[PDB]
Symmetry: none
Subunit: 240 residues, 2 copies
């Protein structure tokens, strides 16, 4: 285990996302409040409910919007570890406090602590991967994803290609936000939301914009065929 995987408390300091989403860290990370009227937090035993203040604010804003549209409870998965860095177990992003997984269910009855520790995913996609399951696809999930994508701090939302396909069909005229939706493997039961580098995180590295347009055509069809010096310095000064 790396020091990043063992630390239990954020590094004190002005909030700073340092490096790139898949090679970085964060100083001064905020903690997502566990108690909220609008969302609940899955798998808190992992201690991955930390991130940039912008990420916490985003979760709070999105969840308030969802609640005010009369929808159910937003379910929050992995943000990042207290000082960011690479997880032990799975994906390599979520290193700079700007990535969050959100389950694509909005339960009308809040989940228990046991349900939150061992969450039961709902696959929204057909076995062959070609389309969403029509009896599971809900306008509320379209709205959850669209509300996230229209937020100015969001750059990308990774979802299964079948899910982007349905979003594409449902969007109508107000569809520019689809550009932020990026097809990826899996992501049948959760979306992965990514925010832009915070304005004052000078050592944070942004990605280029996605390809132009909604992305609902050729690109979608094709889917159906060492640390940054300032992070290393935290180790050299013995802070992780």
């Amino acid at each position: 285990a790396t020091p990043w995987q063992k630390i239990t408390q954020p590094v004190p300091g002005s909030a700073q996302s340092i490096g790139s989403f898949s090679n970085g860290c964060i100083v001064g990370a905020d903690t997502l409040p566990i108690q909220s009227e609008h969302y609940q937090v899955m798998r808190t035993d992992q201690r991955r409910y930390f991130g940039h203040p912008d990420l916490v604010m985003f979760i709070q804003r999105l969840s308030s919007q969802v609640s005010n549209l009369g929808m159910g409870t937003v379910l929050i998965g992995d943000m990042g570890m207290p000082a960011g860095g690479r997880f032990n177990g799975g994906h390599a992003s979520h290193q700079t406090g700007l990535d969050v997984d959100i389950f694509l269910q909005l339960p009308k009855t809040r989940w228990t602590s046991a349900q939150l520790l061992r969450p039961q995913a709902l696959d929204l996609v057909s076995r062959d991967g070609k389309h969403v399951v029509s009896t599971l696809w809900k306008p509320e999930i379209f709205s959850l994803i669209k509300l996230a994508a229209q937020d100015k701090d969001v750059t990308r939302i990774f979802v299964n290609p079948a899910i982007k396909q349905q979003l594409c069909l449902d969007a109508g005229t107000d569809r520019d936000w689809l550009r932020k939706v990026r097809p990826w493997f899996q992501h049948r039961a959760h979306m992965h939301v990514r925010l832009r580098c915070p304005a004052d995180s000078l050592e944070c590295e942004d990605q280029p914009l996605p390809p132009s347009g909604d992305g609902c055509g050729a690109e979608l069809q094709s889917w159906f065929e060492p640390l940054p010096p300032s992070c290393q310095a935290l180790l050299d000064e013995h802070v992780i």
Copy 2:
């Protein structure tokens, strides 16, 4: 109607409805063009209203000169229109045309045109287009047809409409003209409005409002002969 082998002399007039009518003064689609070829000419079903001929000519020159291949024209109608002995419910008034959803990059031979080989663009289960066969040139063929001011409807398999809904981007209004129907996996059926100088042609109402990429599309993945037409038959 099979027995009238040449267009009836007179000013061009589409008479009656698409599935119960005929045409006086039908134009003939020229068999020879650099922009399109005519399938099954042995059946002698390349006749229709001047507006249909002109539509085929301008669609085809746009498609061909965009470098997307030449167009393959199927049935228009008989020389005086009228009901078919089989296959077609419509194509009686000179305002319907079948067009194959293949754009040959070199001209088909006479034998290929006489016995045309369809290319099924749709999956076996009907739920999507075949990912390796759907191409931007076919999107463009259908879009250019649908954006034509004289066209009212284009019938295609629901999987094809779904794909057009995905490809259209922000320039979408023409999607309303595209109507899902059974089959139509290898051809589109284009329909034109009644000509502006029509005397007794019957139009259909507009399609349902909107692009049609929502609930209607989703649901697919679950009178006597007009007197002028009788007079044509009587005159033999």
